[PDB]
Structure formats: structure tokens, C-alpha cells
């Protein structure tokens, strides 16, 4: 199967952060003993782990910026890179930073610059410059573009091209919905059917040279397209998340831990009512959906900032604590703590 | 003001849940030297407050229970109770369940039968069977009505005997809403008036004797008809708590704990936002309401108990921790234990 990888991506908003490193870049170099996997990043790293670890042997990488300014960091040694990520990242994370955020102050932004470490070309892929080229009979095609408006113009430009039936993915820098509608403002055509299309993501949730994880979303693709996908991804990435489009931003984005937060009360409190009180799911559903529309419903009347002159935190330590068994004593008491601080 | 308590309560119930005790109103009967005050529950309990503390030199309790089988168990001196509940409640608590759950197999349920251990009488209170009688004149009229469609029947032989302006209140046996639309059935009249009734609750969250609170509706009743509820229940109940009305079950029935679990995390989610992104409230509000939304959307879609199924909640981890920070920080850690157990 043909796998298009479309956006190299740039190394220098990884750096700029501070908090990234290179260890499931480095797991996967010692897993298929290439140290040169060690310092990928972004799509070449998924995209070796697919050659690598899935089995997918055809693999293209297009991307503008090889004809223009794409820079490849040789400063430091994957062994060491390797070596240093067993014990600790950080005894050699603060110097690629420096290294790259000095690169990064005088070089221009993506399509024009990009910064790496390892040429894909030196893992065997195809390279090219020319989009079209890179999807003729790919079966899988990674997008990996920047946000914002250029993503339509990006993608008409060889939209006609997709072979049909194609599973087409996205990553963290466009909404599946507004993925689709790009697509979709080419329903009609009966030469290239876009209508037939598997529309999905292959979402990191996270630098991908750091973390082996993919998130993969349902409402467009079929069946068969998804359960492809996520059997490819468990394999390359090691850890795979099948999970409906319009939960994608809520797990992924930075609201991640107030849904975190949410699912782990919702599951705990469900728990302790079915397994303690014996009753019917159906009954800790009624409940917990008028608790979580009316705290939402709060928020959005009063604004998030003045909830506590609505509604005491306290109000609740008088009232859940008799809750304070099953499941939910794992959590409760450290709402409790939180509450406690908080009331007026 | 005048008072009007209108229902005095059984306490079968309190005893049949085996885990109640009397140690609030313990708490007040010695912080007025009247040992009797030790064994009240319900209502009286609360009566014996708003006389006692709040200076309400005036009430009427009204049931009908008083012409039936109204039971005084005097076989427990408020002295070991009170004692009892200096140290340990359950060195006292269990006989003192034993013999209302026996007296109480046999005993007819409220209206007919009632079990108590102080006689309201005994509390300098006016005792009576006619609910038309207690309201006349009354300022503050405290019902206490059984679950059911019974409460408009008792409501609709008062209703034109309630003074103007009087404030009316309701616990935990009917929402607000619900309560509202029974007085909502005479806007017509222009002798009664009840368009100008100050609905709220007096809602103690929990059985009045144990605990020192009370849970106030706003949302029916006039800002300042509110205000000096709350300024009687503060010094009544020792805790005093306003809220919006929809907020009301949420807040005191067996859902109390998620609103709880998810209220800490609002609050932490927003703080860590504004102090540690320096991005404005409005930011984490339209994250927090996405992610709220989503959550409830798919419980709701896929039933409480398939939510794994559909949302591995391992999916969690390697996304929310990367907001392990700020006021997040200090419920996170017990979120990703407990996700982490129930990962797929």
C-alpha cells in the first residue's frame, strides 16, 4: 500500500516549547537497531515507523521546502541522542533547544524553512516537491499542514488526483469537520468521486518523536477505512485511540484536562451508584446529565471567572461527602482538599 | 417574624439508612443549654434553631400526625446521646436504630404514624392539625410535604390563606420548579395575590440533626426576600448556602458528587489558564464548555455504561498531562491513576 506523507514539518516550534524530547523516536531506533530514527520528527517519524514497523514499504514525502531552505542539524551524535534518553532526555534536550531556537531566530517559516536532523532520504523514502506526483496511487495520505486558511488552497491543488476509495488523514492543525468540507466542496465530480473518499486523522496528540500514541477519528471514514487505520497505527505507533471526530479537540487540545477530569467523575460516580446502590445504569445517567448540563449551563451564564460568587464551592463538601464511597472515594477526597481551599 | 412549619417529619427514614446521628443538634442544644434539642430531627431540629438562634420569637408547627399515632420514644436520655456524640455517635447510634426500625415495621408511615423523641410542644411550640390555621399572618411558611402528588392537594387548602409577600419554602422532597407551578395554578386572582409569594427552599442537604447547613433557590423569590433567608439559615443552620435553583438537585441529591468532581475541575482548569497562560477567562471558558459539552454528548449518545467502549479512557493520558500545571496539578495525578486502572 502507497503511503503519501504530505508536510515534512519543522523542528523549531518543538524546541521553542521546552518540554519536548525524543524518546519514542529513540525506542523505535533501537527496536529496528537504525540510530538514525533516533532524532526524527513530526510525519518522518510516524512515517518510519510505518516502513519500519507496519510493513508499509512504499513511502513519499512531499513537501515544498526540500527545493527551498530545509536544514538538516548534524551538530550532535543519534548515539548520544539514544544513550542520553535512557537515563534522562534532559542531559542533552537543553542543548538541541539552544542549538535549533538559534537556527530557527534567522531562518524563514515553513514552506521556505525547515529544520531536521535526519534527511527522510536517508530512511529510504521517496522525496519530491510536487504534491500531485506524491498522491498518484497512494492509498494512504498523512496531510500535515499549517493552520489556518492555506489548507484549502494546498489541498485543491491536487485534490483530483486522490485515487478513490483513499484514506485521507489530518493532525493537529485543522478540525476533522473542517477537513471534510474541503472535500466536500468537490462532491459532484464523476471522475475523481471525492465522495468516496475515507476522510480520518492520524492525530499524534503530541510531538510524535516523544510520545507513541495516534487518535484516530469516526464520522467520515467507513468501517473498514478506520479499523485499517487503527490496526496500522497500534503496530507504528504502538498505542492507537479510535475515537469520534467531535471528541478529537476535547482529548487532544488543551482542554484535555478538564475532559480528563470530567470522564474520571463521570466513570467513578457511575461505579459507585451501579455497583453500591445496585441500580440501573439508566438512573446514574438521568442524574449525571442534568449535573454536568447545569454546571456547564452556570459557566456560560455567569462566566467562568464568577462561578464561586454563584455558587459556593463549599455548597458541595455538605452534600457529596456522604457520596464518599465505591469508586468515587478515589477521587472525592481530593475534591474535597480542592473545595475546601476554595469556599467562601 | 411568624413562622409556620408545616410538616414535623419521621424519622423511620433517617434510621432505616443507618447512617445518620444527631450531632448538630447536639451542637446546638449546647450552645443553649436545653438538653431536648439533642433528639430532635427534621424540621424541629430546625425550628429549634430559628427560635433559639435566629430570635424567631414565634412557631406553629402544623400535621395532621398530631390527632393520629404521633410516637415519643423517650427510652434514650439526651444525656448519653449527647455525650455519645462528644466522642463517637456509633457507640449510641445503633439501638437507638434498633428501636425505631422495630416500633417502626408496625407503625403506620406519615400522616397517620410518626416517630420523634422530643415533643415539639416541649419546645415551647404552638402544636396543631390545621394547616389554614398555621399559615394566617405567617411571614415564613417551611413545608415539609412527602414526595408525590399529594403536595399540590396540601398545598391548594392554604393557598388563599398565605399572606402577601410570604416567604414559602420546600426541601428535598420536590424541586423548586415543580414547587413553583402549583402557586403558578391561582395567577389569576386578584384576591389571593400569590404572584407576589416568595418561593425559594430551606433544603438542609442532609438530615437537619446531623449536619449544620441549608441550601437556599434563587430564581422565584425577590433579591431581598433571598437575602434575609440567608442571613436566618447562616445564623440557624451555622452554613448557609444561595444558589441558582436548576443548581438545586445537582448541588444536594445523589449527584452532588459529580457536580462536585467536575465543579474542582472547572475551577482548577480555568486557574491554571489565567495564571500560569496569562490567557483572559473567556479563553478557558470556551475550552471548558467544548470539552464539558463533548463529554456529556457522548454519554448521552452511547448510554453511562458503554462510554469505554467508544472513548478508551487511556486515551486521557498522553494528552492531559501535558496540562499537569498550575491548580490542574494538584487533582491530575489522582485523574490519571484512576484512568489509567480502566484503560483498554
Excluded at 467520515?220 to 485499517?228: G, M, N, V
Aim: aromatic share 8%; charged share 25%.
Amino acid at each position: 500500500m502507497k503511503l503519501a506523507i504530505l508536510g515534512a514539518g519543522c523542528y523549531r516550534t518543538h524546541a521553542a516549547s521546552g518540554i519536548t524530547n525524543f524518546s519514542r523516536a529513540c525506542e523505535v531506533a533501537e527496536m529496528v537497531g537504525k540510530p538514525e530514527i533516533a532524532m526524527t520528527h513530526s510525519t518522518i517519524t510516524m512515517g518510519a515507523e510505518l516502513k519500519e514497523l507496519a510493513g508499509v514499504d512504499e513511502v513519499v514525502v512531499a513537501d515544498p521546502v526540500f527545493d527551498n531552505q530545509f536544514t538538516v542539524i548534524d551538530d550532535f551524535a543519534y548515539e548520544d541522542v539514544i544513550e542520553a534518553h535512557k537515563e534522562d532526555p534532559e542531559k542533552i534536550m537543553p542543548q538541541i533547544r539552544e542549538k535549533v531556537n538559534e537556527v530557527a531566530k534567522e531562518l524563514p517559516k515553513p514552506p521556505e524553512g525547515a529544520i531536521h536532523f535526519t534527511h527522510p532520504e536517508d530512511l529510504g523514502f521517496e522525496i519530491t516537491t510536487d504534491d500531485r506526483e506524491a498522491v498518484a496511487d497512494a492509498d494512504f495520505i498523512m496531510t500535515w499542514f499549517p493552520k489556518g486558511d492555506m489548507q484549502p488552497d494546498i489541498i485543491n491543488k491536487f485534490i483530483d488526483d486522490i485515487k478513490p476509495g483513499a484514506i485521507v488523514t489530518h493532525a493537529c492543525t485543522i478540525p476533522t469537520t473542517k477537513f471534510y468540507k474541503i472535500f466536500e466542496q468537490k462532491h459532484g465530480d464523476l471522475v475523481t468521486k471525492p465522495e468516496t473518499l475515507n476522510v480520518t486523522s492520524y492525530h499524534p496528540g503530541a510531538v510524535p518523536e516523544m510520545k507513541g500514541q495516534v487518535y484516530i477519528a469516526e464520522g467520515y471514514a467507513s468501517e473498514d477505512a478506520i479499523e485499517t487505520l487503527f490496526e496500522l497505527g497500534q503496530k507504528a505507533r504502538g498505542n492507537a485511540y479510535r475515537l469520534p471526530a467531535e471528541l478529537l479537540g476535547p482529548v487532544c487540545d488543551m482542554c484535555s484536562a478538564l475532559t480528563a477530569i470530567t470522564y474520571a467523575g463521570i466513570l467513578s460516580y457511575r461505579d459507585s451508584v451501579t455497583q453500591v446502590l445496585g441500580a440501573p445504569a439508566s438512573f446514574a445517567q438521568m442524574m449525571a446529565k442534568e449535573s454536568l448540563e447545569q454546571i456547564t449551563a452556570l459557566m456560560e451564564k455567569v462566566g467562568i471567572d464568577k462561578m464561586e460568587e454563584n455558587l459556593d464551592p463549599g455548597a458541595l463538601l455538605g452534600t457529596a461527602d456522604s457520596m464518599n464511597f465505591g469508586a468515587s472515594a478515589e477521587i472525592l477526597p481530593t475534591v474535597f482538599e480542592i473545595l475546601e481551599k476554595r469556599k467562601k
